[PDB]
Write a protein that binds this ligand. Structure first.
Ligand code: HEM
Ligand SMILES: CCCCCC/C=C/[C@@H]1[C@@H](C/C=C/CCCC(=O)O)[C@@H]2C[C@H]1N=N2
Ligand SMILES: CCCCCC/C=C/[C@@H]1[C@@H](C/C=C\CCCC(=O)O)[C@@H]2C[C@H]1N=N2
Ligand SMILES: CCCCCC/C=C\[C@@H]1[C@@H](C/C=C\CCCC(=O)O)[C@@H]2C[C@H]1N=N2
Length: 445
């Protein structure tokens, strides 16, 4: 029987013994945590599957709290998730030497080269023939499926240097990946039913084979990002089978957000003609588009930054009140709920307004009840630990949007359509994914 100690957050066990709020937290994390915020405020502790999870939603505390890596561990949870989702183990892996390299390969001159290759690869994949325009003037597709297809294939070819895969082989990989990706949330939660466990297992196995071209004598490039990664695993005594499985882990890490983000960007522009105009005008340093991307990320970048509490920690909210986390609990931080979707910070937060971050110049002054908000949106995580793939991802999103808007005419099938609702299963996992899709048609401009 867990009991609240002095200055611990509000405690909400739910009614189901042991299990607590696990189901509901899992089904839709935004709805459930919003519910709890309303009930309890900016900090509260929830029971889920025998564990107690403290959630911090006071955005000005995020950095200072998360900077404390002595009290807050990413690694052990990442292990469990790695096992549950990717059917993977990496005994004796040092995550530190590979965190450093991920940061170096995706910035500076290293990023310039990858971005160049990304551009070249996107051009190869946006040929009339690649766009399915060999049979008619117009081609019907879902905007989401199209945006993911194009960025997945570009990211893949660029980051893995997998030109060994032909046009139809890339389509097969993407489609298999999608079956895996679709199931990744349930898989992360251990909520997979019989059929879904089999589909997941089947997709993983095809991908493990396809992503490592075993039969080919392709000398590894050990100075590349992916090559140095495999070499490290090999030097750590990690067997060939696990190397093969790490490829699917690295595929998700690098390809599972950008295409989806580009979908939302395009979705919002196609449904907001004034935003589309201001972007199209600009396409002839891009302050407008910058704002459009940042708005899109406010609405759809929903990582649930999670940590295990390794030691008791005293924590302070903006009002000065003090709370105690206890060793063995989890801590979650959710910038989606606040600041991104906080109505006291961004008025009408459910609405896409392209200029939200433009003055009458970048808008940088934001407030909650007269308090300065340093970070009005937090898609890349916290200032101490910013996503190392962000510059690459933004480049890629720009490149797709630019290209589509310039070389294609793209129309919504239903003239009055809006962007689909969000598939709530996605909250916590990065860029959100549409419930259904946005039906479009396109042609060579
Ligand atoms: C729209 C695109 C993306 C978004 C919104 C996003 C979001 C995030 C967030 C919020 C974190 C912080 C995780 C944490 O603190 O626990 C993170 C970390 C990370 N991201 Fe991304 N990401 C994106 C794209 C990418 C891409 C394209 C790559 C690879 C090229 C990538 C690689 C990584 C890696 C390796 C980390 C781990 C940092 C660490 O904890 O050591 N991400 N991402
Ligand atoms: C505890 C899980 C840590 C996972 C560390 C690997 C980072 C993965 C990033 C992901 C962002 C994280 C989303 C929520 C993961 C939970 C967390 O990092 O606390 C996706 C893929 C890549 N960029 N975007
Ligand atoms: C939502 C995220 C789910 C994907 C799982 C993320 C996996 C994260 C691993 C992290 C730590 C996991 C295991 C390290 C210990 C290896 C072991 O003993 O199995 C970092 C980055 C990657 N490898 N090291
Ligand atoms: C990685 C963040 C996205 C996950 C979406 C929410 C799902 C599961 C967990 C939440 C609790 C909900 C169910 C507990 C089952 C997870 C487990 O067995 O570890 C919070 C955040 C994560 N760990 N604690």
């Amino acid at each position: 029987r867990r009991t609240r100690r002095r200055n611990e957050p509000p405690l909400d066990k739910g009614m189901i013994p042991w299990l607590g709020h696990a189901l509901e937290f899992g089904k839709d994390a935004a709805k459930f945590l919003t519910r709890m915020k309303e009930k309890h405020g900016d900090i509260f502790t929830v029971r889920a599957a025998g564990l107690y999870i403290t959630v911090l939603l006071d955005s000005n505390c995020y950095d200072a709290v998360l900077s404390d890596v002595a009290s807050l561990d990413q690694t052990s949870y990442a292990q469990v998730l790695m096992k549950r989702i990717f059917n993977m183990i990496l005994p004796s892996h040092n995550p530190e030497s590979e965190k450093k390299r991920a940061e170096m390969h995706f910035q500076g001159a290293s990023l310039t080269q990858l971005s160049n290759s990304m551009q070249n690869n996107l051009r190869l994949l946006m040929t009339p023939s690649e766009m399915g325009l060999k049979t008619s003037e117009w081609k019907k597709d879902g905007l989401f499926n199209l945006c993911y297809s194009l960025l997945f294939k570009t990211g893949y070819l660029t980051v893995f240097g997998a030109e060994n895969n032909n046009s139809a082989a890339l389509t097969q990989i993407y489609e298999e990946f999608r079956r895996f990706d679709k199931l990744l949330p349930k898989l992360a939660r251990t909520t997979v039913n019989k059929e879904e466990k089999q589909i997941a297992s089947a997709a993983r196995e095809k991908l493990w084979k396809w992503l490592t071209p075993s039969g080919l004598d392709r000398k590894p490039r050990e100075q590349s990002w992916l090559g140095s990664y495999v070499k490290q695993l090999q030097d750590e005594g990690i067997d060939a089978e696990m190397q093969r499985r790490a490829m699917l882990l690295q595929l998700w890490v690098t390809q599972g957000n950008a295409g989806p983000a580009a979908f939302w960007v395009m979705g919002y522009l196609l449904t907001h003609p004034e935003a589309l105009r201001a972007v199209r005008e600009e396409i002839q340093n891009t302050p407008v588009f910058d704002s459009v991307l940042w708005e899109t990320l406010r609405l759809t970048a929903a990582a649930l930054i999670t940590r295990d509490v390794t030691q008791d920690k005293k924590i302070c909210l903006s009002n000065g009140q003090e709370y105690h986390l206890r060793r063995g609990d989890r801590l979650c931080v959710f910038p989606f709920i606040s600041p991104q979707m906080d109505p006291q910070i961004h008025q009408q937060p459910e609405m896409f307004q392209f200029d939200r971050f433009l003055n009458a110049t970048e808008k940088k002054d934001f407030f909650k009840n007269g308090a300065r908000v340093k970070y009005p949106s937090v898609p890349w995580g916290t200032e101490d630990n910013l996503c190392p793939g962000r510059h690459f991802a933004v480049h890629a999103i720009k490149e797709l949007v630019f290209t589509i808007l310039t070389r294609f005419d793209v129309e919504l099938c239903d003239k009055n359509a809006t962007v689909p609702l969000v598939d709530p299963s996605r909250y916590g996992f990065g860029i959100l994914q549409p419930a259904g899709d946005l039906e479009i048609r396109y042609r060579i401009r």
